[PDB]
Amino acid sequence: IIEPSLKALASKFNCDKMICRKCYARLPPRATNCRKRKCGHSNQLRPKKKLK
């Protein structure tokens, strides 16, 4: 098992992210535009699917 606080710390780096709908890039949680250039800085973002 993993201590609850440590699991929260690790989740920050690989669980709480936004995903662009055009190039599947990882984005910060509060982002509004993709940073990559090949998708044209699109603003069609969705949250990263949770584990359940």
Partner RNA sequence: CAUGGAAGUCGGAAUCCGCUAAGGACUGUGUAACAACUCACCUGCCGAAUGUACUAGCCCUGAAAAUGGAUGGCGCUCAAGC
Residue 23 in contact with another protein, rule: CB under 8 A: no
Residue 31: exposed, middle, or buried by beta-carbon count in 10 A (0-12, 13-18, 19+)?
middle
20 binds, among Zn ion, another protein, RNA, none (CB under 5 to 8 A by kind): Zn ion
Site map (CB under 7 A) of RNA, residues 23-42, x = contact: --------------xxxx--
Alpha-carbon dihedral 41, 31, 9, 24, rounded to 10 degrees: -30
Binds another protein by CB under 8 A, chosen from 4, 24, 32, 51: 51
Q: How far is the CB of 42 from RNA (least distance, A)?
A: 8
